[PDB]
Amino acid sequence: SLPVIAAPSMWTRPQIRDFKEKIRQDSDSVITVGRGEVVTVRVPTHEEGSYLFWEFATDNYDIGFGVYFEWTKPVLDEIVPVYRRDCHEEVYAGSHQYPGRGVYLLKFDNSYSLWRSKSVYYRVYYTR
């Protein structure tokens, strides 16, 4: 049979303010998504790691979030359908098992927003 992709896990945590001030100590970890833009962050599968863990939050407004996997023209598998998240209120997080060797695409989708730019704080780990 063909590869069976494991379902992703997702959750939230109430402390948004503490999360940002932790990230603000790192500049490259903060992204500004422009009007009607989609900023994709590519996260290649680590040779050692079995899993990907993600965390993201926004400042004053909601933003679209989805997760795609790019194998290594290239194949693209949909893990987390892009949807608008309330992450301005809460820190949104999740995890997923490596379907194989490839590159994760974390998409922050501002397309629907005409007049409003979005500030994005994010962090990523991996497990063995």
């Binding site: 896990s9 959750w11 945590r13 402390q15 503490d18 999360f19 932790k22 490259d28 992204i31 422009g34 009607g36 833009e37 989609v38 900023v39 994709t40 962050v41 590519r42 996260v43 290649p44 680590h46 790691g49 079995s50 899993y51 863990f53 997080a93 995890s95 098992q97 962090r123 990523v124 780990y125 991996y126 497990t127 063995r128």
Partner: protein, 43 residues
């Protein structure tokens, strides 16, 4: 050394900034460096 899904189940309920540090210390999770991340922007 707990399984990856066991890490996730733990977090979902009690996830905090303190737990992350602890899980970081034990080596249960490894922060991906800026080197491995690339930014792509599109309208």
């Amino acid at each position: 050394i707990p399984a990856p899904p066991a890490i996730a189940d733990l977090l979902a309920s009690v996830d905090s900034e303190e737990v992350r540090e602890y899980c970081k210390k034990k080596g249960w999770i490894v922060e991906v460096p800026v080197t491995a991340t690339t930014l792509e922007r599109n309208v």
